[PDB]
Amino acid sequence: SDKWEKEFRIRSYEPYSNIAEWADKLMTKKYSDLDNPTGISVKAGDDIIVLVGDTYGQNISMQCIWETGTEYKQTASSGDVYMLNPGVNKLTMKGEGQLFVMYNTELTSNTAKPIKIHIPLGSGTVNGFFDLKEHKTDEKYAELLKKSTHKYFCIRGEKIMFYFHRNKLLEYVPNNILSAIHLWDNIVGWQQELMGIDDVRPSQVNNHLFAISPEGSYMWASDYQIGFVYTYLGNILLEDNVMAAEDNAWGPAHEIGHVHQAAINWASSTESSNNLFSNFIIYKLGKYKSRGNGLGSVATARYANGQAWYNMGDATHQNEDTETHMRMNWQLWIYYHRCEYKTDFWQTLFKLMREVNMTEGEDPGKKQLEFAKMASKAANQNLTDFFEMWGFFEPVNTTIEQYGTYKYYVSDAMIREAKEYMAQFPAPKHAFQYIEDRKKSEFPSNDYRYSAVGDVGYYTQFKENQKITKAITAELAGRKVSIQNGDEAVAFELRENDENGKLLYFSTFTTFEIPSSILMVNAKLYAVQADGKRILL
Numbered sequence: 001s002d003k004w005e006k007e008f009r010i011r012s013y014e015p016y017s018n019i020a021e022w023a024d025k026l027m028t029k030k031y032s033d034l035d036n037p038t039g040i041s042v043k044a045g046d047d048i049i050v051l052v053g054d055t056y057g058q059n060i061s062m063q064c065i066w067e068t069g070t071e072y073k074q075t076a077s078s079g080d081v082y083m084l085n086p087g088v089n090k091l092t093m094k095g096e097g098q099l100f101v102m103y104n105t106e107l108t109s110n111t112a113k114p115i116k117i118h119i120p121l122g123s124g125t126v127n128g129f130f131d132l133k134e135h136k137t138d139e140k141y142a143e144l145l146k147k148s149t150h151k152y153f154c155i156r157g158e159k160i161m162f163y164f165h166r167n168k169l170l171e172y173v174p175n176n177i178l179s180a181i182h183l184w185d186n187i188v189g190w191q192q193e194l195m196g197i198d199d200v201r202p203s204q205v206n207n208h209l210f211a212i213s214p215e216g217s218y219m220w221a222s223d224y225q226i227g228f229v230y231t232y233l234g235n236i237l238l239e240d241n242v243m244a245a246e247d248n249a250w251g252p253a254h255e256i257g258h259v260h261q262a263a264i265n266w267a268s269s270t271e272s273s274n275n276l277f278s279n280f281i282i283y284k285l286g287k288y289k290s291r292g293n294g295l296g297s298v299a300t301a302r303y304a305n306g307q308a309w310y311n312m313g314d315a316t317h318q319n320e321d322t323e324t325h326m327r328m329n330w331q332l333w334i335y336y337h338r339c340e341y342k343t344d345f346w347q348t349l350f351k352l353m354r355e356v357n358m359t360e361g362e363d364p365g366k367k368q369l370e371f372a373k374m375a376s377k378a379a380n381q382n383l384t385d386f387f388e389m390w391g392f393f394e395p396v397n398t399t400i401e402q403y404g405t406y407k408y409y410v411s412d413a414m415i416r417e418a419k420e421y422m423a424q425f426p427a428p429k430h431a432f433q434y435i436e437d438r439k440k441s442e443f444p445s446n447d448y449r450y451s452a453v454g455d456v457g458y459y460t461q462f463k464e465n466q467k468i469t470k471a472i473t474a475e476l477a478g479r480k481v482s483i484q485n486g487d488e489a490v491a492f493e494l495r496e497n498d499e500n501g502k503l504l505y506f507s508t509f510t511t512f513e514i515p516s517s518i519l520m521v522n523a524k525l526y527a528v529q530a531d532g533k534r535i536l537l
């Protein structure tokens with residue numbers, strides 16, 4: 001049984017990067033610095049011997065992690081810290097918890113080597129912990145789990161760690177962790193993929209995300225740790241519980257989205273900008289279709305109701321219409337990525353937005369415009385029409401509430417400069433503001449998407465540059481428009497005078513009611529071809 005004790009009591013601990021630093025450079029919430037569990041539990045007053053080999057001039061320490069919270073209990077993100085020096089260290093635990101070695105430094109340095117640390121028999125208790133790359137098997141996992149005896153058992157993957165209640169692991173996955181750990185690692189790695197931060201990971205930044213099980217709340221993300229309530233873990237740990245319903249994979253991936261949204265996020269978007277990641281994950285898991293409202297929601301909000309981006313579907317200015325907003329980033333991915341007109345668009349755009357380096361709340365009005373401009377630069381196309389449709393070029397002077405209160409100010413002159421800046425790029429090859437990745441026939445009639453996604457503008461029409469080749473007509477009966485032979489178009493527009501007058505309404509349905517509030521006088525109807533050609537009707 002000592003071969004088990006020595007797996008954990010004698011170990012070479014690798015260096016991990018500094019979290020504060022990389023949070024700044026990559027514009028994320030802070031990852032965890034609890035990358036190096038010992039696998040050793042302790043109790044208050046315990047005398048602990050730690051023998052540290054050569055440290056190469058590094059400063060390392062030991063931290064006891066336990067629990068925090070008044071309302072209920074959860075795993076804390078920091079704890080009692082004890083300094084370590086090369087040689088002999090005798091520590092007296094101020095409290096219970098598990099031990100973690102804090103070895104955080106610059107990774108490119110030739111002195112960033114593993115440090116051997118020996119916690120000799122009789123010092124605390126060996127709980128154990130499972131690492132994916134070194135223990136490799138469900139079988140070893142079960143063994144370690146059973147031998148474990150502490151309230152929490154740590155599981156370390158490549159990109160994420162779990163730090164969950166022992167008995168919940170026993171109750172749900174008492175014998176199999178590989179599926180779970182491979183899946184959550186994939187999510188994190190996918191979100192990280194879109195951000196274009198592969199150049200610096202794992203060579204300069206290598207910290208994990210660290211998932212705890214609070215005895216309260218539902219699910220969330222913050223600096224240092226992300227949380228999934230312990231009564232819910234069954235939908236975390238069993239990939240069949242994750243893959244069984246649409247919304248099981250989402251809510252978590254949305255939570256890891258919060259960690260990564262800052263570069264491209266501004267207040268008014270905080271609960272939608274992260275669902276670029278959410279929808280990317282769903283796409284990658286390969287079973288369900290995309291989430292969000294149809295473009296009819298945009299038209300209604302923008303035009304029947306005069307709203308701009310910041311208050312779309314939201315006259316109050318307090319809580320966000322996430323189901324409408326989330327389609328905006330996603331359309332950019334559908335076109336540039338799924339239709340392959342630029343397969344590293346998002347990676348490029350994230351890089352640019354990190355260079356812009358604006359916080360989410362410092363100036364949301366200007367940030368919205370910086371994002372339209374950087375998206376134009378990222379595509380190397382002038383995306384003025386996309387961003388007009390989405391309500392980026394409407395004046396705003398007010399204040400909003402979303403995790404704080406913020407001044408939202410967009411002026412005519414700000415609007416003017418963004419457009420001129422974006423003008424310097426060539427015209428877009430397609431009017432992909434009308435793109436969808438969903439068609440009606442994929443959904444049952446009780447699904448909200450069946451009625452919401454419209455009839456035209458499916459992504460293949462943009463990917464195969466479909467032309468309009470048919471006897472396309474239109475009949476107006478009261479407020480009801482009906483299009484004949486328009487199934488090759490991508491949308492239908494009411495413009496102000498000619499095909500270059502401002503947009504007054506649009507639809508991706510071939511039959512639709514115009515709302516009363518639209519002003520019809522001198523207004524014309526055009527069918528939009530995938531590539532931007534408008535055609536009078």
Ligand code: NA
Nearest residue numbers: 007008134135
């Ligand atoms: Na080992």
Ligand code: NA
Nearest residue numbers: 131132133157
């Ligand atoms: Na590992």
Ligand code: NI
Nearest residue numbers: 009119120121
């Ligand atoms: Ni020993």
Ligand code: NI
Nearest residue numbers: 388393394502
């Ligand atoms: Ni406008």
Ligand SMILES: [Zn+2]
Nearest residue numbers: 254258270271
């Ligand atoms: Zn959220």
